[PDB]
Amino acid sequence: PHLHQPSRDLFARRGERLLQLAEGHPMGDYLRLVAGLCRLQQALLDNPPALAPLDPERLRKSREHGMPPLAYDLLVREGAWLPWLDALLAGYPAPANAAVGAALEQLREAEEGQRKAWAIALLSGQFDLLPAALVPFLGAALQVAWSHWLLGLEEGAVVETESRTLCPACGSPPMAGMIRQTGLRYLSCSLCACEWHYVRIKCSHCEESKHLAYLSLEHGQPAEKAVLRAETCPSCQGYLKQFYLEFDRHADALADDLASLALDMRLAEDGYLRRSPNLLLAPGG
Ligand SMILES: [Fe+3]
Ligand SMILES: [Fe+3]
Numbered sequence: 001p002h003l004h005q006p007s008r009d010l011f012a013r014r015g016e017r018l019l020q021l022a023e024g025h026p027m028g029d030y031l032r033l034v035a036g037l038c039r040l041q042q043a044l045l046d047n048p049p050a051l052a053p054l055d056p057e058r059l060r061k062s063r064e065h066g067m068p069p070l071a072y073d074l075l076v077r078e079g080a081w082l083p084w085l086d087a088l089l090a091g092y093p094a095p096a097n098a099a100v101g102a103a104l105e106q107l108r109e110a111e112e113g114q115r116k117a118w119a120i121a122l123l124s125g126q127f128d129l130l131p132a133a134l135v136p137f138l139g140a141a142l143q144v145a146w147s148h149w150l151l152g153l154e155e156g157a158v159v160e161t162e163s164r165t166l167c168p169a170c171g172s173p174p175m176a177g178m179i180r181q182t183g184l185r186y187l188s189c190s191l192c193a194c195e196w197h198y199v200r201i202k203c204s205h206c207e208e209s210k211h212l213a214y215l216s217l218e219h220g221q222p223a224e225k226a227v228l229r230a231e232t233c234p235s236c237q238g239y240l241k242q243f244y245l246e247f248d249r250h251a252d253a254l255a256d257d258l259a260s261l262a263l264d265m266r267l268a269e270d271g272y273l274r275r276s277p278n279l280l281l282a283p284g285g
Contacts, residue, residue, distance in 0.1 A: 002160045003168070004186060004195035006147060011042035017255035025259060033096060034258060034280060037136060040091050041144050048148060049083040059157060069157045070149050070170040072123045072191055079116060081145035088141045103133040123172065123191065125277060132285030139279035146170055146192035158194065165204060169194040174204065175276050176253040177231065177242030185242070188253035190277040205275050206236035215239075217263050227251050228260050232272055239272040254278065 007013060015038035022028035022035070059069050075081065089108050095101045107115070118138055121129035130138070150158075150169050159168035166173055167189035175190035177198075186195040187204060202209045212233050216226035227248045230239045241263065243251040257278050264274060 001184070002162070002197045003158055005151060006193040006195070008045070008151060009042065010147065010193055011038050011045060011144070013250075014038045014252050014255050015042065017250055017252040018258070020250065021255060021259040027259075027261070031255075031259060034136070034255075037140050037280070038254075040088060041140055044084065044087050044091060044144050045148055049087045051083055051148075052080045054080075054149065054152075059154065063157055066159070068159065068167065068169055068171040069153060070146060070192060072146070072170050072172050073120070075149075075170075076119050076123055076142070077116065079112060081119075081142060082112065082115065084145040084148075085115060085138065085141040088137065088144070092137070099133060103131070104137060106131065107134055107137055122279065127282050127284050132282035135282040135284065136280045143191060143193070143279060150192045150194055158196075160196075162197070163199055163202065163207060164196065165198075165207070167192060167194050168196050173276055174240070175278050176257050177204065177240050178251070178253060179242055179244045179246070181246055183244075183246065190279055193253075203233040203236060203238060204231070204240045205238040206233065208233060208235040210235060215263075215267070217266055228256060228263060230263055230267055230272075232267070232270075237272055238275055239267045240274075240276055254280070 015035040018031050018035035018038060022031035025031060062069055062071060089104055092104060095104055118130035118134065119142060122135060122138055161168065170189060170192045172189055172191035174187035176188050178186045178188050178195060180186060185198060185200040187198045188195050198204065203212060212231055215230045215232055216223050216228060225247050227243055228241060230241050232239045241257060241260065243256050245251050258281065
C-alpha cells in the first residue's frame with residue numbers, strides 16, 4: 001500500500017479533530033476558528049463549483065515525462081483552481097473580526113493575476129510575497145482544489161516511486177509524517193493531502209539514514225505513548241513532526257500540527273529547521 005488517497009470526508013474529520021484537540025488547549029480559540037474553515041472546505045468539496053476539467057492530453061504527457069499529474073507550479077499558473085477561491089469567499093459571510101474581514105475583502109477584490117501571484121508565493125514558501133492574514137483563506141482554497149483534483153484521478157496516474165521527498169501527485173512538500181499501525185510510515189502532502197510511503201529510517205529532506213533522533217514533549221500524557229514525535233537529523237539539521245496512529249487513531253496531519261506548535265519552538269531553539277509547510281498558517285508575518 002504505497003499510496004493513500006485521502007477520505008472524501010478529510011475536511012470534516014480535520015475540523016472534528018481540531019475541536020477535540022482545542023478542549024483545554026492554550027490556543028483553543030484559534031484551533032476552533034480553523035475548525036470552522038475546515039468545515040467550509042468540506043462543504044465546498046461536497047458541492048464543487050463549475051470547473052474546467054483537467055486536460056487529458058496534458059495529464060498523459062506529464063505522466064509520460066515522469067512528472068506529478070497535478071504539478072503545483074504549472075496548475076497554479078493555469079488558474080483553473082480560481083472558482084474554489086470565489087466559492088470559499090462567498091461561503092464565508094461571517095468573519096470573526098475586522099482584520100479577517102479586511103483579509104477576505106482583499107482576496108475578493110484582487111484580480112486573477114494578483115490572486116495567482118499570491119498563490120505561487122504561498123505554494124513556493126515565499127511568505128514575504130503575500131499578506132500573512134490572507135494565508136489561511138488562500139491556502140484553504142488551494143487545498144480543496146488540489147484534493148478535489150486528486151480524488152478525481154485516474155488511478156495509476158500518481159507516481160509510486162519509493163523514496164520521494166515530494167508528493168508524487170502534486171510535487172509539494174509534506175506537512176507531516178504519519179506512522180500507521182514494524183509499522184509503515186507515510187508522508188502527508190501539504191497541498192493535496194495525498195499520503196505516500198517513505199522509508200521509515202530516513203531523513204525526509206536530505207536522504208541520510210544515519211542514526212536519526214526522535215523527540216517528544218509532555219502534554220499529563222506520557223512519552224512512551226506519545227502521539228507526536230519529531231524526527232530530527234543532524235546532517236541537515238531538519239525536523240519533521242510525525243503522528244503515530246497506534247496511540248491515537250484520530251490523529252490528523254493538519255490538526256495535530258496546529259495543536260503542537262510548542263514542539264516547533266522547542267526544536268527551532270535547538271537549532272533545527274522545518275521544511276514542511278502548513279498552508280493554513282504563516283510563520284508569519
Ligand atoms: Fe500533493
Ligand atoms: Fe537530513
